[PDB]
Amino acid sequence: ALAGTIIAGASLTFQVLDKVLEELGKVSRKIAVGIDNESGGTWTALNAYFRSGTTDVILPEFVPNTKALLYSGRKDTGPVATGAVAAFAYYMSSGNTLGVMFSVPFDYNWYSNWWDVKIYSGKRRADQGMYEDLYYGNPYRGDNGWHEKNLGYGLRMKGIMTSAGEAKMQIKISR
């Protein structure tokens, strides 16, 4: 499998993430995630809090510098109008937590995809509160556009998320 695995940070592309989407099988709402670590340190998985949907793989436990982690999620199968929404966190070698959120809703008649990345002081597990902190703060939109910002702690992030039902999200965390 590709999801739940790590690869050379330089080989992370949309082609790889699209293949991650294929791997998820045929479900109307899913997301492929690739996060390139260039923070000058290793990361260790904490957990993932899925508010909507689920995942079939486990968070790559270790992500060394120059490496990209691959992950994925999707809506529950069946006649349920739900999407793929979650927040997951990785513990950094600097002692802080990297928090990531993705929201892929079922109803684009009224909603859009949104995502965000944030660094939290210390060891912080992903939960409803972290989810609300990323989604209700100032999240980027899945607009097929690249965005970037400083995350404090001398680190920055540049990334992108697509706008439809089978979403791809690529992020790079640099120092």
DSSP bridge pairs for 6: 69
Gap between the Cα atoms of 24 and 115, Å rounded: 20
135 is in an annotated binding site: yes
Tell me the two tokens of residue 5.
């695995």
Count of alpha carbons within 13 angstroms of residue 128, beta-carbon side? 0
Resolution rounded to one decimal, in angstroms = 2.3
Task: Kindly report the CATH class assigned to 1-175.
Answer: mainly beta
Gap between the Cα atoms of 96 and 86, Å rounded: 20
Distance of CA 59 to the CA centre of its chain: 11
103 is in an annotated binding site: yes
52 is in an annotated binding site: yes
136 is in an annotated binding site: yes
90 is in an annotated binding site: no
Report how far apart, in Å, the C-alpha atoms of 104 and of each of 28, 126, 158, 168 are: 11, 18, 20, 10
91 is in an annotated binding site: no
DSSP structure string for the chain:
--TT-EEEGGG--HHHHHHHHHHT-S-SSEEEEEEEEESSS-EEEEEEEEEESB-SS---SEE-TTEEEEEEEEPPSSS----EEEEEEEEETTS-EEEEEEEE-S-TTT---EEEEEEESS-----HHHHHHHHSS-PEE-SS-EEEEEEETTEEEEEEE-SSSEEEEEEEEE-
